[PDB]
Amino acid sequence: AIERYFIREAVKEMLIDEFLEKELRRAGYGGLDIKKTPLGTKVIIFAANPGYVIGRGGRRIRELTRILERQFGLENPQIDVQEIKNPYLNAKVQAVRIAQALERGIHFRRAAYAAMRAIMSNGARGVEIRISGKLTGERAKSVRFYQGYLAKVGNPAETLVSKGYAQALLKLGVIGVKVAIMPPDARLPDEIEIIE
């Protein structure tokens, strides 16, 4: 029946998104979108360095089209590569960037403060970052960085805040990175104004 049709579409998109998440980690992957046309399927991919996805004049778009058509269930795909709309308001991108900075060898506090500075300058109401794992020794710990306005409990926190998570694999083990960001156009229920 009809319910089975909607579930099949959702699962395939989730599998494709996860495969692209891991595959395009160096390109600053920032989501995808799929549109259905009478000739086939238009697949739009978002990234920071589209040259990496293109991969030195093709030889990689062909591979990805073959993967999409064979392994996954798209018929006659066509991949376009675009640019991220508001990268500093996307928690997932920032979590991946902080994780890569940690993998390079920067100290965790400096990386966290740099990311917060960029996010706040780019027009966000608030940001919260948490970093957990074996930071400075064999006994694990968690550290939290914060500034601005950020709702945490209730329906507004669910529908307004952008959330992201990433793992950073260092020589001693993994380090978890969590990011939350609230946009400039977010308005809480208790913020009323008088119509002048």
Binding site: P189, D190, I192, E193, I194, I195
Partner: protein, 64 residues
């Protein structure tokens, strides 16, 4: 406990001062006035604000 909320009181005090000759001791009239003079979107919040404005009008008119 029916303790009035802070932001309701703040906005009702702001509305009352700006238009002293706009709110009466009628709940329906004040409800329509709150509807026209703000961007409040919740029906519950509008009613709370209108009720507090009614109490303010009768408290100041009585002279406290």
């Amino acid at each position: 406990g029916k303790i009035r909320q802070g932001f309701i009181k703040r906005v009702a005090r702001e509305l009352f001062n700006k238009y002293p000759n706009e709110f009466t001791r009628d709940f329906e009239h004040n409800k329509k006035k709150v509807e026209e003079l703000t961007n409040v979107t919740s029906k519950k919040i509008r009613n709370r604000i209108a009720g507090y404005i009614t109490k303010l009008v009768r408290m100041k008119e009585e002279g406290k």
